Amino acid sequence: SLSCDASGVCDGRSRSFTSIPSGLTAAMKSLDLSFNKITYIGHGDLRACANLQVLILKSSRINTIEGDAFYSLGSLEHLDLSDNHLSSLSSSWFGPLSSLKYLNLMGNPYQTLGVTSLFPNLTNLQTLRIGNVETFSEIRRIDFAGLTSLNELEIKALSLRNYQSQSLKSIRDIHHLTLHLSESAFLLEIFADILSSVRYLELRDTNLARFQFSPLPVDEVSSPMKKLAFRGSVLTDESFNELLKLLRYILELSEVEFDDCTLNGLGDFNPSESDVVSELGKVETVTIRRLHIPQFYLFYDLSTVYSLLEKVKRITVENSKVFLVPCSFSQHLKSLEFLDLSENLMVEEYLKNSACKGAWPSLQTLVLSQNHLRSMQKTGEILLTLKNLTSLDISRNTFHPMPDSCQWPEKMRFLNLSSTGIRVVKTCIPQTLEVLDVSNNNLDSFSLFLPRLQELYISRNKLKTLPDASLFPVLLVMKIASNQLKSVPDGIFDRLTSLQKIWLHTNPWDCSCPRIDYLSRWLNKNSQKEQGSAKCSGSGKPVRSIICP
Ligand SMILES: *[C@@H]1O[C@H](CO)[C@@H](O[C@@H]2O[C@H](CO)[C@@H](O[C@H]3O[C@H](CO)[C@@H](O)[C@H](O)[C@@H]3O)[C@H](O)[C@H]2NC(C)=O)[C@H](O)[C@H]1NC(C)=O
Ligand SMILES: *[C@@H]1O[C@H](CO)[C@@H](O[C@@H]2O[C@H](CO)[C@@H](O)[C@H](O)[C@H]2NC(C)=O)[C@H](O)[C@H]1NC(C)=O
Numbered sequence: 001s002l003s004c005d006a007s008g009v010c011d012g013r014s015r016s017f018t019s020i021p022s023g024l025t026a027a028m029k030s031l032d033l034s035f036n037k038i039t040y041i042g043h044g045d046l047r048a049c050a051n052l053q054v055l056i057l058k059s060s061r062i063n064t065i066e067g068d069a070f071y072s073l074g075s076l077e078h079l080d081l082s083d084n085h086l087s088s089l090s091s092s093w094f095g096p097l098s099s100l101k102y103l104n105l106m107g108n109p110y111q112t113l114g115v116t117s118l119f120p121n122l123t124n125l126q127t128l129r130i131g132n133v134e135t136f137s138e139i140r141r142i143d144f145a146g147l148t149s150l151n152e153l154e155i156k157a158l159s160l161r162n163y164q165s166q167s168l169k170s171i172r173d174i175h176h177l178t179l180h181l182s183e184s185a186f187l188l189e190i191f192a193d194i195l196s197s198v199r200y201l202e203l204r205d206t207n208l209a210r211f212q213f214s215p216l217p218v219d220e221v222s223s224p225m226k227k228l229a230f231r232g233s234v235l236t237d238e239s240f241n242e243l244l245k246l247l248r249y250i251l252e253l254s255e256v257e258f259d260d261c262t263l264n265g266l267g268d269f270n271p272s273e274s275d276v277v278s279e280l281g282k283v284e285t286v287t288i289r290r291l292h293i294p295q296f297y298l299f300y301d302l303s304t305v306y307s308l309l310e311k312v313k314r315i316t317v318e319n320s321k322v323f324l325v326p327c328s329f330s331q332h333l334k335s336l337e338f339l340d341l342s343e344n345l346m347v348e349e350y351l352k353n354s355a356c357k358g359a360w361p362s363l364q365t366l367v368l369s370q371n372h373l374r375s376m377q378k379t380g381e382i383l384l385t386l387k388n389l390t391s392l393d394i395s396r397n398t399f400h401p402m403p404d405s406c407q408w409p410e411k412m413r414f415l416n417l418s419s420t421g422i423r424v425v426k427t428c429i430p431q432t433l434e435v436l437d438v439s440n441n442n443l444d445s446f447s448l449f450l451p452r453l454q455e456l457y458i459s460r461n462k463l464k465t466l467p468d469a470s471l472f473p474v475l476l477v478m479k480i481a482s483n484q485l486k487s488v489p490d491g492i493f494d495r496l497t498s499l500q501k502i503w504l505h506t507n508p509w510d511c512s513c514p515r516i517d518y519l520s521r522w523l524n525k526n527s528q529k530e531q532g533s534a535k536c537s538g539s540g541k542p543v544r545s546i547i548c549p
């Protein structure tokens with residue numbers, strides 16, 4: 001039932017094949033036989049595909065593949081056998097695939113990679129994925145013998161029972177390593193074998209409650225690891241302190257991420273010499289999202305965090321119930337340039353403490369995108385302490401109507417007031433602004449003169465009339481999609497003399513011929529500026545299609 005195209009891209013995906021389709025050719029460059037029922041693959045099912053570059057056999061129900069089944073596929077660069085029923089992996093399968101770049105074997109019920117090295121002859125491999133949720137249980141020294149460089153290696157071993165020493169050490173260059181571990185029993189050991197190879201390490205679903213640090217036998221303590229990421233992990237204050245002791249080896253680590261993690265406040269370490277601040281070495285960026293902190297008893301030290309974040313330049317802590325960032329804590333974040341506190345519980349009174357006198361000196365960008373702020377004037381007043389602030393985002397906050405006069409930090413040139421519920425716009429908004437976003441609100445008109453405005457986002461409001469062009473002399477980008485606009489005054493866009501991009505879609509354009517003449521001609525003379533397609537209200541055809549006598 002195949003359906004191929006001019007360039008050899010054939011599609012047999014999700015048919016109902018019970019065996020590879022008969023009579024394939026050497027013209028096919030890609031064959032997608034996913035979601036089928038190919039239970040067995042024999043000696044002569046892919047013989048005639050000498051030019052095949054892509055073979056996708058994901059989620060079929062393959063449980064048997066003859067040893068020389070891929071023998072004549074020397075031009076194969078992408079092989080995906082994921083989510084099948086392969087209980088065993090044969091080394092003869094990969095013998096004739098020296099040109100293979102991507103190999104996905106994950107999702108198969110095998111217990112190990114076998115007794116024979118499967119990839120020694122895959123000189124050009126770049127991406128390898130192996131493992132599964134409950135069967136894969138052993139990793140051996142012969143498993144990756146031969147591989148020297150890999151862009152991406154993913155190992156799913158949530159049921160791991162044993163890891164041999166140095167199994168990972170033979171590989172010298174791994175740009176991205178993703179390990180799915182359920183327990184930490186072998187983590188320490190695995191670290192010993194990846195510290196001189198892994199650039200980006202990613203741990204998934206790991207319970208690190210009982211993780212303990214212990215000296216490692218590095219060769220020169222020069223780890224090329226730049227990004228460390230924990231996702232869906234469980235930690236304790238005790239095991240957390242053990243984890244940061246590992247930083248002493250990754251002298252170059254610049255980004256640490258914690259996604260959907262849990263921090264059980266139990267244990268509560270006390271040993272002094274077993275704290276090791278080390279100023280988190282060279283951590284430049286810290287990102288925390290959806291951190292769940294069960295039973296946050298009373299007051300913790302917090303001082304065992306000041307000296308730790310002294311050199312961090314970017315911090316993000318979103319959707320983690322943050323309601324207060326103590327002043328003395330902010331005063332120690334001397335290098336913080338970017339702070340993102342989106343989706344938390346901040347309110348004026350506590351922001352006032354978080355943004356005290358010497359708080360976040362040198363902070364350039366602040367994001368308070370979805371908290372419990374109620375007053376624009378009060379917020380602006382509180383942020384006057386941040387002398388270096390140039391970008392402020394306070395979108396998705398329910399504000400009371402803004403006054404006519406406000407005080408904002410001196411260098412503020414970016415202000416995001418999106419999804420803020422405002423119905424009017426007033427001079428509280430400073431003339432210094434370059435970028436302003438008041439999209440997704442309840443505006444009926446815009447009359448603010450912003451001489452330096454370069455970008456206006458006013459999409460998703462109720463403007464019936466377009467803003468006067470003289471209001472933005474050097475405007476580069478204007479977004480005014482989804483806005484009840486029916487027409488524009490003749491010649492208005494030629495007056496936006498520096499305009500580069502404009503969004504006009506989703507507006508009930510009155511395509512009556514006399515009236516729509518200007519708008520139509522301008523769009524035909526400026527298609528490179530329009531993003532999306534302004535359509536006629538009623539019919540639905542593109543406004544640029546109209547041609548009036
Ligand atoms: C002003 O603030 C706006 C609202 O906070 C912001 O819009 C939001 O932009 C983010 C990132 O571009 C979007 O992210 C979400 O959606 C993407 C795509 O589905 C997901 O991959 C993300 O995980 C996340 O869920 C928001 O959807 C978007 N909200 C909307 C629709 O307004 C503006 O970009 C800000 N304006 C400026 C000038 O920066
Ligand atoms: C962040 O803003 C502060 C403003 O206070 C800058 O630090 C001040 O710099 C002036 C130089 O004009 C000194 O006279 C002050 O003594 C400094 N304030 C103090 C006491 O810290 C700071 O340079 C800005 N950060 C950067 C590097 O952009």
Ligand SMILES: [Lu+3]
Pocket residue numbers: none
């Ligand atoms: Lu509260």
